Enzyme design. Sequence first.
Site, PDB file in Angstrom:
ATOM      1  N   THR A 159       0.772  -1.381   0.170  1.00 52.00           N
ATOM      2  CA  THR A 159       0.027  -0.109  -0.071  1.00 52.00           C
ATOM      3  C   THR A 159       0.827   1.041  -0.044  1.00 52.00           C
ATOM      4  N   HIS A 265      -8.070  -9.424   2.552  1.00 56.07           N
ATOM      5  CA  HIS A 265      -7.167 -10.203   3.096  1.00 56.07           C
ATOM      6  C   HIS A 265      -8.018 -11.356   3.929  1.00 56.07           C
ATOM      7  N   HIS A 309      -3.089  -1.689  -5.641  1.00 53.82           N
ATOM      8  CA  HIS A 309      -2.437  -3.033  -6.173  1.00 53.82           C
ATOM      9  C   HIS A 309      -3.791  -3.743  -6.001  1.00 53.82           C
ATOM     10  N   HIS A 420      -1.027  -9.629  -1.113  1.00 57.35           N
ATOM     11  CA  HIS A 420      -0.714  -9.044  -2.291  1.00 57.35           C
ATOM     12  C   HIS A 420       0.874  -8.648  -1.589  1.00 57.35           C
ATOM     13  N   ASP A 683      25.889  -1.349 -15.398  1.00 56.83           N
ATOM     14  CA  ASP A 683      25.287  -0.619 -14.053  1.00 56.83           C
ATOM     15  C   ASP A 683      25.857  -1.276 -12.509  1.00 56.83           C
ATOM     16  N   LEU A 689      21.083   3.469 -14.032  1.00 51.58           N
ATOM     17  CA  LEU A 689      21.704   4.610 -14.868  1.00 51.58           C
ATOM     18  C   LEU A 689      22.970   4.220 -15.287  1.00 51.58           C
ATOM     19  N   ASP A 691      26.577   3.762 -16.473  1.00 47.21           N
ATOM     20  CA  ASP A 691      28.098   3.891 -15.638  1.00 47.21           C
ATOM     21  C   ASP A 691      28.774   4.780 -16.450  1.00 47.21           C
TER      22      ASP A 691
HETATM   23  C1  LIG Z   1      14.055   8.327 -11.084  1.00 49.49           C
HETATM   24  O1  LIG Z   1      13.692   9.651 -10.766  1.00 49.49           O
HETATM   25  C2  LIG Z   1      14.654  10.209  -9.760  1.00 49.49           C
HETATM   26  C3  LIG Z   1      14.209  11.582  -9.728  1.00 49.49           C
HETATM   27  O2  LIG Z   1      14.747  12.449 -10.802  1.00 49.49           O
HETATM   28  C4  LIG Z   1      16.145   9.870 -10.083  1.00 49.49           C
HETATM   29  O3  LIG Z   1      16.727  10.308  -8.858  1.00 49.49           O
HETATM   30  C5  LIG Z   1      17.770  11.167  -8.770  1.00 49.49           C
HETATM   31  O4  LIG Z   1      18.914  10.968  -9.525  1.00 49.49           O
HETATM   32  C6  LIG Z   1      20.036  11.503  -9.362  1.00 49.49           C
HETATM   33  C7  LIG Z   1      21.317  10.804  -9.711  1.00 49.49           C
HETATM   34  O5  LIG Z   1      21.357   9.652  -8.842  1.00 49.49           O
HETATM   35  C8  LIG Z   1      20.144  12.548  -8.120  1.00 49.49           C
HETATM   36  O6  LIG Z   1      21.140  13.627  -8.226  1.00 49.49           O
HETATM   37  C9  LIG Z   1      22.195  13.589  -7.091  1.00 49.49           C
HETATM   38  O7  LIG Z   1      21.268  14.330  -5.866  1.00 49.49           O
HETATM   39  C10 LIG Z   1      22.433  14.481  -4.809  1.00 49.49           C
HETATM   40  C11 LIG Z   1      21.569  15.684  -4.013  1.00 49.49           C
HETATM   41  O8  LIG Z   1      20.348  14.933  -3.655  1.00 49.49           O
HETATM   42  C12 LIG Z   1      19.687  15.640  -2.539  1.00 49.49           C
HETATM   43  O9  LIG Z   1      18.855  16.463  -2.961  1.00 49.49           O
HETATM   44  C13 LIG Z   1      17.535  16.193  -3.903  1.00 49.49           C
HETATM   45  C14 LIG Z   1      16.796  17.324  -4.386  1.00 49.49           C
HETATM   46  O10 LIG Z   1      15.778  18.070  -3.339  1.00 49.49           O
HETATM   47  C15 LIG Z   1      16.654  15.261  -3.276  1.00 49.49           C
HETATM   48  O11 LIG Z   1      15.658  14.681  -4.000  1.00 49.49           O
HETATM   49  C16 LIG Z   1      17.658  13.926  -2.610  1.00 49.49           C
HETATM   50  O12 LIG Z   1      16.711  12.896  -1.936  1.00 49.49           O
HETATM   51  C17 LIG Z   1      17.443  11.517  -2.007  1.00 49.49           C
HETATM   52  O13 LIG Z   1      18.084  11.270  -0.655  1.00 49.49           O
HETATM   53  C18 LIG Z   1      16.991  11.281   0.536  1.00 49.49           C
HETATM   54  C19 LIG Z   1      18.251  10.508   1.679  1.00 49.49           C
HETATM   55  O14 LIG Z   1      19.163  11.234   2.029  1.00 49.49           O
HETATM   56  C20 LIG Z   1      15.846  10.562   0.730  1.00 49.49           C
HETATM   57  O15 LIG Z   1      15.113  10.992   1.527  1.00 49.49           O
HETATM   58  C21 LIG Z   1      15.280  10.470  -0.751  1.00 49.49           C
HETATM   59  O16 LIG Z   1      14.244   9.601  -0.738  1.00 49.49           O
HETATM   60  C22 LIG Z   1      16.317  10.541  -1.946  1.00 49.49           C
HETATM   61  O17 LIG Z   1      16.927   9.196  -1.996  1.00 49.49           O
HETATM   62  C23 LIG Z   1      17.384   8.509  -3.376  1.00 49.49           C
HETATM   63  O18 LIG Z   1      18.320   9.173  -3.933  1.00 49.49           O
HETATM   64  C24 LIG Z   1      19.567   9.072  -3.341  1.00 49.49           C
HETATM   65  C25 LIG Z   1      20.577   9.932  -4.325  1.00 49.49           C
HETATM   66  O19 LIG Z   1      20.408  11.418  -3.986  1.00 49.49           O
HETATM   67  C26 LIG Z   1      19.978   7.807  -3.240  1.00 49.49           C
HETATM   68  O20 LIG Z   1      21.339   7.650  -2.559  1.00 49.49           O
HETATM   69  C27 LIG Z   1      18.871   6.837  -2.190  1.00 49.49           C
HETATM   70  O21 LIG Z   1      19.183   5.539  -2.392  1.00 49.49           O
HETATM   71  C28 LIG Z   1      17.427   7.092  -2.795  1.00 49.49           C
HETATM   72  O22 LIG Z   1      17.297   6.208  -4.104  1.00 49.49           O
HETATM   73  C29 LIG Z   1      18.781  14.208  -1.939  1.00 49.49           C
HETATM   74  O23 LIG Z   1      18.283  14.752  -0.476  1.00 49.49           O
HETATM   75  C30 LIG Z   1      23.643  15.263  -5.236  1.00 49.49           C
HETATM   76  O24 LIG Z   1      24.433  15.486  -3.951  1.00 49.49           O
HETATM   77  C31 LIG Z   1      24.252  14.221  -6.344  1.00 49.49           C
HETATM   78  O25 LIG Z   1      25.714  14.973  -6.895  1.00 49.49           O
HETATM   79  C32 LIG Z   1      26.932  14.190  -6.877  1.00 49.49           C
HETATM   80  O26 LIG Z   1      27.023  13.651  -7.999  1.00 49.49           O
HETATM   81  C33 LIG Z   1      27.493  14.709  -9.088  1.00 49.49           C
HETATM   82  C34 LIG Z   1      27.413  13.823 -10.722  1.00 49.49           C
HETATM   83  O27 LIG Z   1      26.854  14.798 -11.350  1.00 49.49           O
HETATM   84  C35 LIG Z   1      28.885  15.226  -8.890  1.00 49.49           C
HETATM   85  O28 LIG Z   1      29.108  16.330  -9.927  1.00 49.49           O
HETATM   86  C36 LIG Z   1      28.359  16.126  -7.770  1.00 49.49           C
HETATM   87  O29 LIG Z   1      29.386  16.838  -7.070  1.00 49.49           O
HETATM   88  C37 LIG Z   1      27.890  15.026  -6.509  1.00 49.49           C
HETATM   89  O30 LIG Z   1      29.240  14.181  -6.479  1.00 49.49           O
HETATM   90  C38 LIG Z   1      29.727  14.501  -5.010  1.00 49.49           C
HETATM   91  O31 LIG Z   1      28.767  13.678  -4.165  1.00 49.49           O
HETATM   92  C39 LIG Z   1      29.095  12.205  -4.016  1.00 49.49           C
HETATM   93  C40 LIG Z   1      28.015  11.660  -3.337  1.00 49.49           C
HETATM   94  O32 LIG Z   1      28.257  11.705  -1.951  1.00 49.49           O
HETATM   95  C41 LIG Z   1      30.583  12.081  -3.859  1.00 49.49           C
HETATM   96  O33 LIG Z   1      30.576  10.503  -4.156  1.00 49.49           O
HETATM   97  C42 LIG Z   1      31.500  12.567  -4.789  1.00 49.49           C
HETATM   98  O34 LIG Z   1      32.725  12.091  -4.658  1.00 49.49           O
HETATM   99  C43 LIG Z   1      31.108  14.112  -4.806  1.00 49.49           C
HETATM  100  O35 LIG Z   1      31.714  14.634  -3.707  1.00 49.49           O
HETATM  101  C44 LIG Z   1      23.302  13.859  -7.529  1.00 49.49           C
HETATM  102  O36 LIG Z   1      22.997  15.001  -8.271  1.00 49.49           O
HETATM  103  C45 LIG Z   1      19.028  12.755  -7.536  1.00 49.49           C
HETATM  104  O37 LIG Z   1      19.060  13.312  -6.203  1.00 49.49           O
HETATM  105  C46 LIG Z   1      17.879  11.792  -7.534  1.00 49.49           C
HETATM  106  N1  LIG Z   1      16.738  12.261  -6.866  1.00 49.49           N
HETATM  107  C47 LIG Z   1      15.830  11.358  -5.953  1.00 49.49           C
HETATM  108  C48 LIG Z   1      14.520  11.859  -5.563  1.00 49.49           C
HETATM  109  O38 LIG Z   1      15.925  10.191  -5.879  1.00 49.49           O
HETATM  110  C49 LIG Z   1      16.229   8.443 -10.358  1.00 49.49           C
HETATM  111  O39 LIG Z   1      17.655   8.307 -11.020  1.00 49.49           O
HETATM  112  C50 LIG Z   1      15.176   8.014 -11.293  1.00 49.49           C
HETATM  113  N2  LIG Z   1      15.487   6.601 -11.715  1.00 49.49           N
HETATM  114  C51 LIG Z   1      15.833   6.172 -12.982  1.00 49.49           C
HETATM  115  C52 LIG Z   1      15.931   4.588 -13.070  1.00 49.49           C
HETATM  116  O40 LIG Z   1      15.792   6.656 -13.953  1.00 49.49           O
HETATM  117  C1  LIG Z   2      -4.466   9.224  -3.249  1.00 52.65           C
HETATM  118  C2  LIG Z   2      -3.446   9.154  -2.331  1.00 52.65           C
HETATM  119  C3  LIG Z   2      -3.835   8.582  -0.977  1.00 52.65           C
HETATM  120  C4  LIG Z   2      -3.040   8.556   0.039  1.00 52.65           C
HETATM  121  O1  LIG Z   2      -3.058   8.406   1.492  1.00 52.65           O
HETATM  122  C5  LIG Z   2      -4.715   7.844   1.693  1.00 52.65           C
HETATM  123  C6  LIG Z   2      -4.683   7.105   2.831  1.00 52.65           C
HETATM  124  C7  LIG Z   2      -3.897   6.047   3.299  1.00 52.65           C
HETATM  125  C8  LIG Z   2      -4.564   5.680   4.706  1.00 52.65           C
HETATM  126  C9  LIG Z   2      -4.325   4.922   5.875  1.00 52.65           C
HETATM  127  O2  LIG Z   2      -5.052   5.153   6.915  1.00 52.65           O
HETATM  128  N1  LIG Z   2      -3.767   3.659   5.654  1.00 52.65           N
HETATM  129  C10 LIG Z   2      -2.822   3.261   4.405  1.00 52.65           C
HETATM  130  C11 LIG Z   2      -2.201   1.908   4.865  1.00 52.65           C
HETATM  131  C12 LIG Z   2      -3.205   1.497   5.948  1.00 52.65           C
HETATM  132  C13 LIG Z   2      -4.293   0.490   5.398  1.00 52.65           C
HETATM  133  C14 LIG Z   2      -4.503  -0.589   6.051  1.00 52.65           C
HETATM  134  O3  LIG Z   2      -3.789  -0.505   7.075  1.00 52.65           O
HETATM  135  C15 LIG Z   2      -2.761   0.284   6.672  1.00 52.65           C
HETATM  136  C16 LIG Z   2      -3.343   2.841   6.747  1.00 52.65           C
HETATM  137  N2  LIG Z   2      -5.345   6.842   4.742  1.00 52.65           N
HETATM  138  N3  LIG Z   2      -5.407   7.626   4.033  1.00 52.65           N
HETATM  139  C17 LIG Z   2      -1.511   8.910  -0.061  1.00 52.65           C
HETATM  140  C18 LIG Z   2      -0.448   8.937   0.970  1.00 52.65           C
HETATM  141  C19 LIG Z   2       1.046   9.157   0.283  1.00 52.65           C
HETATM  142  C20 LIG Z   2      -0.724  10.045   2.021  1.00 52.65           C
HETATM  143  C21 LIG Z   2      -0.595   7.494   1.608  1.00 52.65           C
HETATM  144  C22 LIG Z   2      -1.145   9.408  -1.205  1.00 52.65           C
HETATM  145  C23 LIG Z   2      -2.019   9.506  -2.706  1.00 52.65           C
HETATM  146  C24 LIG Z   2      -1.746   9.903  -3.749  1.00 52.65           C
HETATM  147  N4  LIG Z   2      -1.579  10.191  -4.958  1.00 52.65           N
HETATM  148 CA   LIG Z   3      -3.171  -1.453  -0.312  1.00 55.45          CA
HETATM  149 CA   LIG Z   4      24.940   2.973 -12.849  1.00 60.45          CA
HETATM  150 ZN   LIG Z   5      -3.636  -5.205   1.845  1.00 58.31          ZN
END
Ligand SMILES: *[C@@H]1O[C@H](CO)[C@@H](O[C@@H]2O[C@H](CO)[C@@H](O[C@@H]3O[C@H](CO[C@H]4O[C@H](CO)[C@@H](O)[C@H](O[C@H]5O[C@H](CO)[C@@H](O)[C@H](O)[C@@H]5O[C@H]5O[C@H](CO)[C@@H](O)[C@H](O)[C@@H]5O)[C@@H]4O)[C@@H](O)[C@H](O[C@H]4O[C@H](CO)[C@@H](O)[C@H](O)[C@@H]4O[C@H]4O[C@H](CO)[C@@H](O)[C@H](O)[C@@H]4O)[C@@H]3O)[C@H](O)[C@H]2NC(C)=O)[C@H](O)[C@H]1NC(C)=O
Ligand SMILES: Cc1cc(OCc2cc(C(=O)N3CC[C@]4(CCOC4)C3)[nH]n2)c(C(C)(C)C)cc1C#N
Ligand SMILES: [Ca+2]
Ligand SMILES: [Ca+2]
Ligand SMILES: [Zn+2]
Length: 805
Positions: A159, A265, A309, A420, A683, A689, A691
């Site tokens: 969910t 369920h 789902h 599921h 990769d 993405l 390499d």
């Molecule tokens: C699906 O779509 C998404 C969204 O477009 C794609 O993901 C993006 O991919 C980019 C490349 O991987 C990535 O860009 C990097 O971001 C870094 C800054 O990121 C922060 O800020 C953003 C923007 O607000 C934010 O969204 C990020 O949030 C992530 O992290 C927090 C946890 O800390 C989580 O709450 C969140 O869920 C999210 O996690 C996910 O992404 C991270 C990577 O950021 C993963 O680690 C997690 O597992 C998870 O998947 C961040 O808070 C930025 O710092 C990077 O820059 C480095 O690389 C460049 C290369 O150009 C270099 O030039 C820079 O100098 C820098 O390198 C330096 O740092 C390196 C790392 O420490 C170090 O090794 C070097 O030596 C250097 O010093 C980079 O730009 C972007 O953030 C993510 N976004 C998201 C939302 O995930 C995804 O790719 C798509 N998928 C496919 C399959 O296509």
């Molecule tokens: C349309 C939408 C709704 C939504 O939430 C609706 C929601 C779920 C629950 C809840 O109470 N749950 C969920 C798991 C559960 C059910 C059985 O037991 C565990 C409890 N309440 N409201 C969200 C999120 C990201 C805010 C979750 C995102 C979107 C989008 N786009």
């Molecule tokens: Ca569900």
């Molecule tokens: Ca890669």
């Molecule tokens: Zn369920």
Amino acid sequence: WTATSGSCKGRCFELQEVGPPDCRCDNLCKSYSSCCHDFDELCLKTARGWECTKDRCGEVRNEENACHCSEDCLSRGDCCTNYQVVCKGESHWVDDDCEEIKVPECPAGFVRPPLIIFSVDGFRASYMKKGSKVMPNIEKLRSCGTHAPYMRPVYPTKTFPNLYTLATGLYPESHGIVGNSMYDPVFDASFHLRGREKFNHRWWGGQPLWITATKQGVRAGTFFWSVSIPHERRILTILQWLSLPDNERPSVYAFYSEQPDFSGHKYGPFGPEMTNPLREIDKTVGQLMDGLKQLRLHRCVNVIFVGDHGMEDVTCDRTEFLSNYLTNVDDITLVPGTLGRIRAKSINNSKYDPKTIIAALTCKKPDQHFKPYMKQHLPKRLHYANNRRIEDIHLLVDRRWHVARKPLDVYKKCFFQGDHGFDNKVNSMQTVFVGYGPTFKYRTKVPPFENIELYNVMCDLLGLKPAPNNGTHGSLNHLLRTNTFRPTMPDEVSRPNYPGIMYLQSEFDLGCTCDDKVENKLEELNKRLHTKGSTKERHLLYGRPAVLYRTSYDILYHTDFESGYSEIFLMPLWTSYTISKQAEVSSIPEHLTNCVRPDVRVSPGFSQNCLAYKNDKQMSYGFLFPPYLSSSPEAKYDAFLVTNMVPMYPAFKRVWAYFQRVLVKKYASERNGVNVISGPIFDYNYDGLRDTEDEIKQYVEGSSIPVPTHYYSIITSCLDFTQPADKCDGPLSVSSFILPHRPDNDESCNSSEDESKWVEELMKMHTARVRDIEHLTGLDFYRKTSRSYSEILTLKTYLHTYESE
Ligand SMILES: *[C@@H]1O[C@H](CO)[C@@H](O[C@@H]2O[C@H](CO)[C@@H](O[C@@H]3O[C@H](CO[C@H]4O[C@H](CO)[C@@H](O)[C@H](O[C@H]5O[C@H](CO)[C@@H](O)[C@H](O)[C@@H]5O[C@H]5O[C@H](CO)[C@@H](O)[C@H](O)[C@@H]5O)[C@@H]4O)[C@@H](O)[C@H](O[C@H]4O[C@H](CO)[C@@H](O)[C@H](O)[C@@H]4O[C@H]4O[C@H](CO)[C@@H](O)[C@H](O)[C@@H]4O)[C@@H]3O)[C@H](O)[C@H]2NC(C)=O)[C@H](O)[C@H]1NC(C)=O
Ligand SMILES: Cc1cc(OCc2cc(C(=O)N3CC[C@]4(CCOC4)C3)[nH]n2)c(C(C)(C)C)cc1C#N
Ligand SMILES: [Ca+2]
Ligand SMILES: [Ca+2]
Ligand SMILES: [Zn+2]
Ligand SMILES: [Cl-]
Ligand SMILES: [Cl-]
Ligand SMILES: [K+]
Ligand code: NA
């Protein structure tokens, strides 16, 4: 601490929050244990139920009632939803004929059609046909609006991962909600469904739709509803918000129902007990639509009816126990059920070995109902690896089964008949989509699509710019009457070189040999034209792929195939060839078995060498254009060019050779010719993405030849299979794969058998979208077709699933 003796007087379901220790009246206060003392009294009224009756019509307002039937209710925005029907002789929305909504028909002051997302938990795709007799409101939305036969969820098919994917357009690996239970080792903190850590904002990454809207000046209703708030009250609250003044009224809303999941369920997806929950959901839809119609909003609002789902038949007796495989079973922590995730019980225990856990779980029982994987070896289509919250060891559980650590976990914790969470390709996990409104199309069926695409569309519906996400913006333009996003092809970053003959044979010292000294002016001009691209129209049907990053590469033309050859990676990025229905398969002649030939267009310094392969005892080689499909004995020599060679583990060569010798021809026969584009993927950091060269962890021993992590192929033909692939006038049909490049076939339990018993099954498991390959390669395909770009985007997102009906 919350001092709960402030009042909800006038603030019921307040949109903006107030921060503790002020008491709250929003629909999240229940979850925090922070509601004001009078929240139930003022905000959760129930008196007289939810429906007007004849005797209530024109009553005197009584503010204690749940909803109102008094003359003033419409202007107050708080009539019972059936008021006009009972008291004013109106029809229910469901009894009215479908009439095309060509333009929004909105009250004055509405700047844009509102969006209401009506989300239903566990609503499996086949309920639309199977429950059709009991869901008249839903069936009207479906037949009058735009619908897909099903919508694919993300993995895991749980969910929160799917709701948050709906909200963000991101894969779970990117948004960070990777299961319904999680450990984050950086935070050293655990996320669970029960309790309070799941509300800390550091779990939830990306940018959900309500934040996107808010940042761009569009107001949002709440998305999360507490379980205690009854459905009728959620609907009434939405309808009251829709009566706010223009500067206060949200433009986006969500409803959520815990049904039919809750019942599924307990009773299974098609238990007789399921009819009632489906009826009740339909009734709720009816309430919303009658409510909108009363407010003159039924031809103004865009409604999305979407599930998270489906639901499968799962019982306690279909449980595999890790205690039947592992003796060290107390040294691990399992996240159990419809998937498995394994880590060490203690990070102090350096005896724990992932290799030996994996081996003890691999092909150990004849009908074993789960398969272990290192996360990086999971099918790339699941996009389930690049997050520290995903454990290295993963178990993909067969549909209809569970996995648990010990039997004690199942009976000291049968209850349930449905569950599921399985692989998102599984038919029973597919869910629903209907869009109804001015912006959606009228009476239109669209093909199945993935839920990661909807964020972009919801942004389009609201005039918002989406945050970066995993949708392919424009792939769902065909759902929409208007607001289409007009995408453009990305610009090519690197242009190719077109090398001619520049090197003499004796400049190469590659340690390769070929038995090929076999000396004509008809056929001299012939071979020159082939090397300058005379057959390229035949083998390159949709233009050359564009290279979207900075690099150095060469286009190489041949009689039977064309390639884009990387001087940096020393092999092709892509190899393109067309195999007609009539094409013949031939063998590799005995004298050419080990033949590798220098390519006089490409320098020794940018070529592979045979000695490296000889020295590398683990690594062998294959060819991207298969020698088996050569058009003639003389053309066959081109296939043995060093520029067509790629590194392959012998175990993988079994897979690849069967693909190339048997399967390509089978597909050409079945599809009336195919065009094939094949290549390597790198990769090593499992981020989905491409390499850079400094990310490569493995080379062919003693060389700079990098070892791919995967091999891809994209196989395209005419959707109208009466036309041959090379003379197709209309839409295309595609299937693709991304095969892991592994040194063993441990994944395939039947691999000791002939390849006809296991290879094609492996390739199906690793089915892929063209877009997945694009991410992994930095290439852009289908650049030159006669089709619209939106149609091509749809094609690039297609997944061939290989499930039956
Ligand atoms: C699906 O779509 C998404 C969204 O477009 C794609 O993901 C993006 O991919 C980019 C490349 O991987 C990535 O860009 C990097 O971001 C870094 C800054 O990121 C922060 O800020 C953003 C923007 O607000 C934010 O969204 C990020 O949030 C992530 O992290 C927090 C946890 O800390 C989580 O709450 C969140 O869920 C999210 O996690 C996910 O992404 C991270 C990577 O950021 C993963 O680690 C997690 O597992 C998870 O998947 C961040 O808070 C930025 O710092 C990077 O820059 C480095 O690389 C460049 C290369 O150009 C270099 O030039 C820079 O100098 C820098 O390198 C330096 O740092 C390196 C790392 O420490 C170090 O090794 C070097 O030596 C250097 O010093 C980079 O730009 C972007 O953030 C993510 N976004 C998201 C939302 O995930 C995804 O790719 C798509 N998928 C496919 C399959 O296509
Ligand atoms: C349309 C939408 C709704 C939504 O939430 C609706 C929601 C779920 C629950 C809840 O109470 N749950 C969920 C798991 C559960 C059910 C059985 O037991 C565990 C409890 N309440 N409201 C969200 C999120 C990201 C805010 C979750 C995102 C979107 C989008 N786009
Ligand atoms: Ca569900
Ligand atoms: Ca890669
Ligand atoms: Zn369920
Ligand atoms: Cl989970
Ligand atoms: Cl919210
Ligand atoms: K070798
Ligand atoms: Na095997």
